[PDB]
Amino acid sequence: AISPFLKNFYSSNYF
Amino acid sequence: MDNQSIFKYSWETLPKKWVKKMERSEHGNRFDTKTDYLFQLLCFLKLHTYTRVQVLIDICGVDYPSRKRRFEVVYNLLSTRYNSRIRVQTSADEVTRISSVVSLFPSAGWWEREVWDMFGVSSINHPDLRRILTDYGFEGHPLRKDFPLSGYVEVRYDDPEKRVVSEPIEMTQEFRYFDFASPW
Amino acid sequence: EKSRYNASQVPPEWHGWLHFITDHTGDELLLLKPKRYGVEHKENLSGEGEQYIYHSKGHALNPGQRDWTRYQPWESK
Amino acid sequence: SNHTAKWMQDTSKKSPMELINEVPPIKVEGRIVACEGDTNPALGHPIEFICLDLPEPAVCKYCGLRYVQDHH
Amino acid sequence: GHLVRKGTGGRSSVSGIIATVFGATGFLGRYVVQQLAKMGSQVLVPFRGSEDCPRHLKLMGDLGQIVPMKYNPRDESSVKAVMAKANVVINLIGRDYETRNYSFEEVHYHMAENLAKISREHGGILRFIQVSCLGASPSSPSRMLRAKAAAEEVVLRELPEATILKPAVMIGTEDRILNPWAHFAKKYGFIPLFGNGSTKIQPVYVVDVAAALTTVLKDDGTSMGKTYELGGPEIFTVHDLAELMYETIREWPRYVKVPFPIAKALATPREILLNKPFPLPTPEILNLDKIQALTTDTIVSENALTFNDLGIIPHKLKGYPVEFLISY
Amino acid sequence: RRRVVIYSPARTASQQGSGKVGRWKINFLSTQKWENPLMGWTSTGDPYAHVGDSALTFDSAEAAKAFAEKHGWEYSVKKRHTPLLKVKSYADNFKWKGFPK
Amino acid sequence: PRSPLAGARVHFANPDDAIEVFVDGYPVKIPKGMTVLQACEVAGVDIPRFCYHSRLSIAGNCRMCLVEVEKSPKPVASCAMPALPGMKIKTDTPVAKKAREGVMEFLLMNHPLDCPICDQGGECDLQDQSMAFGSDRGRFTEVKRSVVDKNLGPLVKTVMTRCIQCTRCVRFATEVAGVQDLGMLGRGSGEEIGTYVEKLLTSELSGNVIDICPVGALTSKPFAFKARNWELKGTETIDVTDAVGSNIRIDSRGPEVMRIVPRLNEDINEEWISDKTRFCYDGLKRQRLNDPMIRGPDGRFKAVNWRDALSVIADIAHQVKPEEIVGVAGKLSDAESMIALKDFLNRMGSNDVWGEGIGVNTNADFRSGYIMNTSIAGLEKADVFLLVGTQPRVEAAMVNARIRKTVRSNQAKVGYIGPATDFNYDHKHLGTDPQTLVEIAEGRHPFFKTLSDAKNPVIIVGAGVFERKDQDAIFAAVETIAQKANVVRPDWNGLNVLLLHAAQAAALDLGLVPQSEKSLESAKFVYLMGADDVNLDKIPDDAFVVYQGHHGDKSVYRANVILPTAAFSEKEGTYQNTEGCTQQTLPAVPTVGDSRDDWKIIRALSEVAGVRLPYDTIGAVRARIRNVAPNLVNVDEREPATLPSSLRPSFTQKVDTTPFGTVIENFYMTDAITRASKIMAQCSATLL
C-alpha cells in the first residue's frame, strides 16, 4: 500500500 | 437567374404556418423550416402539380459548435420537370428525433444512415438503422468538430500473441497544424 | 550485361533519350554534363547488403547513428 | 564545420560552403550589380541588387558570389 | 548509463532498451521479441541463413525497431558486429536434435561460451538473459542436458551478473509435442506413451514465460545475477496431458505401450546413421532427449525461485493456452 | 477527464492587424511529446494534440463555457486584456518647453 | 451597436461632454481631442498603418492610412488628424482605395525582393497590407537601390536593404528606451538608419525594437532563420526572471521553445519586454539535469531511481537531525511548492524555512509593508519620486520604463539615493547614506520641501534592503517621512516597495522568514530549491544537502543528492508580482528527461518519510493555500492592503551609518536560468 499517488509518481509525470 | 419561377410560386401558395426563413440568393434558394413540419412541407412538394420535385439529391449535415442548436440538416432536391432545385434546411440539436422521408423518397435510407453515424442526429422512423460508413463499433461520431482528425483509438495491428488487435493511438510525426491567418 | 541486366543501369542522358522525353543523344547531354561536382551513375542496388544499400542518420545499421535530443545533460566531470 | 556536419555525412567530397569559397570574387566595374547566373528564369535567384561600397567582398544571399568593385 | 523511458508505452515509444536476441527465429524467440517491441525497444535479430525466416517479426514494431542483421555463428567478428550497440542480450539458441555438422555439445555449450566471451569483449552490456531448460547438472541422460548445465555454469562464471531462466516444457500455438501428437493421431494409429505412460511434467504457457522474461528484464534493481526455474500452473502426467489434447481435439484416445525397448532400439539408429555424408530426416516423435526426459521425472525443484517469486503463474492449461487445437 | 483553459488569443506581437482578436478558444494543455528515435520527428500520443486550436473556434466565452461544461471536462476561464484608449495630439508632439530657469 | 476593435475601453475624461462623428455612415461618440484614426477604430474599422504605434508619438510619415473626410479637400492622413464634431469620415471610397493602391505601389517599387529568405515573411505588415489593400501587378524594371547591412550587437541584426523610412525605431529609441543612438541620416532615396560611428546599443528594450520594426529588417540574431511564424504554437504565460511578472507568449515547436514575445497587458508591461527575458530560453534548452543523482563516496554522481533517492533522503532526515532542519525556497518557484515545502518541514517537526532573498532579520509581515501599493498603472499619476537604495533600471526594468514614461509625459522631479548609476531621465542624486534618509525624515536636505510641495508623491524602497541588518530603522524613517509629508492619504497610498525576484512576494506572503540567523551554520540537513546560500558556503562540512531543482549550474557541486524538476515553462504554478497581483503560468513544452513538479516531489518525499500531507491534488493544494493566504487562490486580480504600517521597531538607535550596497549586478548572469544560459553570457561580455 503506497497511496496510489506515489504509485503514479514513480511512473511518468503526466497523470 | 435560374429558378425564380418555381421558388416564387412555392412561397406564394404555401401554408405559411411552417416557414421560418426564406433566402432567394443566387447561390441557392433556401426554405429554412421548423423540424416539426418538415415531412409535411416535403410531402406538399413532390405532389403539387406545379412545384413537383420528385427527386432528392442530397441530405447533408453541417456542424456549428457555437450555437444552441448545434447541428444543421440540409436537403438539396431538384425538379426534373420544372428545371429547378431548392434547398430545404432545417435545424437540429443533440438528441431530437427528426422525422423521416424514406416514405416519400426511398433514396434517403443511405443518406440518413450516413448522417446518423458521421454526425449524431437521430431519426425517429425507419431510416435510423445501424451505421454505414464508419467500420464497426465506433466510439464517437467522426465528423463533428470534436472527434479529432486522428481518432481516439485507431492503432490496429497484427499480434502473433493471438491474431490482430485495435489499441489506442501513439502515432509518430504528430499532425502539424499551420496557422496562415492574416490580420489585415 | 547479358546475365544480370537490370533497368536503371542506363545513365541519365540515355534515360531521357530512351524514354522519348527529349531526342537529344546521350553524347550531347554528356557534352553538357555539369562540372565542378557530380556523382557517377549507380543502379538501384537496394538488395546487395545494407552497406551497398544505405540508411538514415538514426537507423542502427548506419555507421553514423545520430542522436535526437534538442538539449544537453548537465554532465559533470 | 557544424552545419555541414549536421546535414552532410560523407565528409569526403567538399561541402557546398567549401565550393562557394573556392570560387573567387567577380571584380565588377560599377557600384551595383544583380545576381542570377546566366538566364533570367530557369536559374531562379530573383533580382538581388547589392551595394559595393566596402573594401571587402559583398555576398549575394543566394548563391554567394562575392562581387567586388574594381577601381577606387 | 541508466536508460530512460521517453514515451507512454505502445508502439513508437522509445523506453530505451536495445536488445540483441540470439535465436529470435523460432517459438520463444517470436514471443519474446513480440513482448519487447510491443513494450517499445529496439531489437536486433540475427538469422543463420535465410531471407524470410525472421520476416514475420519484421512487422511487430515501428520503423527501424526490429532489424535483421547477418550470418550469426562460427565467427567472432560477425557476433561482435551484431552486438555492436546492444543494451541487453537474450540467448535462446538450441535445437532438440543433432545434425552431423553440429552437436548438442557444440551448439549449446560452445555457443554459450562464445556469447559470454564476446559480451566480455563488448563489456557495455547491462543484462545477459540466457534461457536454457528445466534441466539439471550431468545427473540425467540426454547429453543435451549435461552440456546445457555446463553451459549454465560457464555463463554464470564468465558473467556473474547474469540471469538464467530454466522454463519447463512449453505449449503454445506452435509447440513440438501437441502438434506432433495431433499430426500422428490424425494420420494413423494413435499416440504412443514412452517410458511408463504416467511420467510427470509441468507444461507452461509460453506467453506467460515471455511475460516472466520481460519482468526479469525490467526488474528494477532486484535480481541481477539469478538462476532459477519457471514451472507451470499444475502437475500434469503425460497420460493426462494426452487426454487433455484428446478432449480438446474431440477424438478418441488410443495409446501404444511397451515403451522402453521400442523407444531405445528404434531411436538409436538415427544418431549412428547420422554421423555416418548427407542430412537425414528430423526426429518427429522418436527423439532421444524426449525418451530420456520422459523416463526421468522432471517437474519442479521447489527450492530456488519460481513464477510466484517473479509473477503470477500461467492462467491455466485448459481454456485459452490450448485453444489453438481447434484447427483440427 | 482533462482540465482545459478557455482564453482569447491576444494580438500577435509582430503585426498591427485586428482580424484575430476577440475570438474565444479552448485549449487542452496537452504537452507529452518526444523525439522519434529513427528520424527526429515529434511523436505524440494524445488524441487531443491539436484539435482544440485547429478546429474548435468559439464565438464567445459563454458559448465555449457551455460547450466545455456539456462535454463534461472541467475548465478554468482566463481573462482577456483589452487596450486602453488614450487621447493623442500632434500638438502634444510639438509641445513647448518653458522659459530658462 | 458596434463594438470597438479588440474591445477598447475609452476613457471619457469629462463624461458630461463628448463629440460625435459620422464614420462611414453611422455615428460614434468620441472624447474631446481624439484622432481620426482612433475614431475610426471606435467605430470598428481598421485602417492600414505603418508609422503609427499606440505607444509612440504620431508622425504622418508612412502615408498609408489615408481616408477622405467629407467637408475637406481630397486626401487626409487619418492619424494626426484631430477629430471634429460632425466631420463626414469615409474609408472605402474610390479616392481612399486609389490612394492606398498608389502608396503600396511606391513602397513595393523600391523594396528589395528577398521575401523567401527574409524572416518575418508570413508575419510582415507590408506583406499583408499589400495583399489585402494594394494592387496585384507591378510596373517597374529599372535598377533599385541597395545599402549595406549593419550590426547592432548580438541581439538585433539588420539587413537595411528594406528600411522603408518609418522612424518607428528612431521614435522608440528616443522616447521609451532612453538612449539616443539610432537616427535617420541621409537624404532622398539615399536615406539610411544607423548609428554613424558603428557603435552598439547598450540598452534593454532592443528586443522591443525588433518587435516594433514592422518590415523584417531589424531581427533577432539568435532567432536568425530557425522558423517562420505559421509553424509554431504560442502559449500565453508570465515571466519569472524579472519581478514585475511580465505577460509574454512562448512560441514553441515540438519539445523546443523557439522564442518569446510580449502580449498586451495594460496594467503591468504595456506591450514591451525587458531585454533579459526575450533571450532567456536558449539555455533553458542548453544546460539541464534530467535524472535523480546520488553522490558516490568517490565524490562522483550516479543516476539512481526515484524509489532509492527518496528512500535515502527520508531515511537520513529521520535519522539524525532533531532540531536543525532548514529549507531554502527557490528564487524561481511557485506558491504551491512553497506551501508544500513548509508543510513537509513543519510535519517533520523541525522548522527553519526561508525564501530566497528575504532577510534573516525580523522582516515583519504587513502586506502594505512588503508589496508595491500603488499599482504600476497608477504610477503614471505621480509627481515626485523618492527612489531609495534602488536602481530600477537594472531590476524591474518594466517599472523603470514606467517611471520614464511618467517623466516624459509630465516632468516629475525624481530623487534617488544610493550608489552611483546611469539613470536615463534627468535624475537628482541625493546621497548614499541612510543618514541622509534620516535628515530628510527630518528637516535638512531641502528636497523634503519638494515632497511637502507635492501632489501624489511616491516613495520607492528597493527590496535589496530586506537583507541589510538594520531594516526596521529604514522603514521607520520612511514611516516618519510619510506621516510628516502626507503621502499615505486614503485617496492615494503612495508608499511602494519594489521586489527583485518572482518568488519573493509569495514567500513573504506565506511567511517564509528564518526564525533564526545562524541557521545554515548550525544546520545538518539543508533542503535547497534555489542556489547562492551565501556563496553556497555557510553550510558546514558535514551536512546532508539535497538540491531539488532544475537547470543545475551552481551549488550543485556542493549538493549531496540531486532531484530534477520542471522549469517555469513546463508547469502550472502561481507567481505573485510586486503590486500584489497573482498570475499563473501555463505549460508549453514537455518536461525534460524524467523530472517531476515541485509540489509532487515534496508530497512523495513526505509520504515515503512517514508523516504525509493530507492533500494530493492541485485543487487541495490551492485549498490549503486559501487557508493560509487567500489571494493566491484569488488569482488574476490585485487585492490591496487596507492596513497601515504600524510595525514595532527594535533598533531605535540609528541606521548603522553604512552605505547602500549594490543589490544586483551584470543584469544577465543573475537568474540561474540565464546564467547557465548563454546569449545573456555574450551580452554580458559585449554590451556593457
Ligand SMILES: NC(=O)c1ccc[n+]([C@@H]2O[C@H](COP(=O)([O-])OP(=O)(O)OC[C@H]3O[C@@H](n4cnc5c(N)ncnc54)[C@H](OP(=O)(O)O)[C@@H]3O)[C@@H](O)[C@H]2O)c1
Ligand atoms: N522443447 C521446448 O519447447 C523447450 C522446453 C524448455 C526449454 N527450451 C529451450 O528454449 C529455447 C528455445 O527453444 P525453441 O523451441 O524456440 O527452439 P528454436 O526456435 O529452434 O531455437 C533455436 C534457434 O536457433 C536456430 N539454430 C539451429 N541450429 C543452429 C545452430 N547450429 N547455430 C545457430 N542457430 C541455430 C534455429 O533455427 P534457424 O536456423 O532456422 O533460426 C532457431 O532459430 C532453447 O534454448 C531450448 O533449449 C525448449
Ligand code: SF4
Ligand atoms: S519585410 Fe521581408 S518578407 Fe516582408 S515584404 Fe518586406 S521583404 Fe518581404
Ligand code: SF4
Ligand atoms: S526597416 Fe524597420 S526601422 Fe527601417 S523604415 Fe522599415 S520598419 Fe522602419
Ligand code: FES
Ligand atoms: S499611419 Fe497615418 S501616416 Fe503613417
Ligand SMILES: [Zn+2]
Ligand atoms: Zn547569388
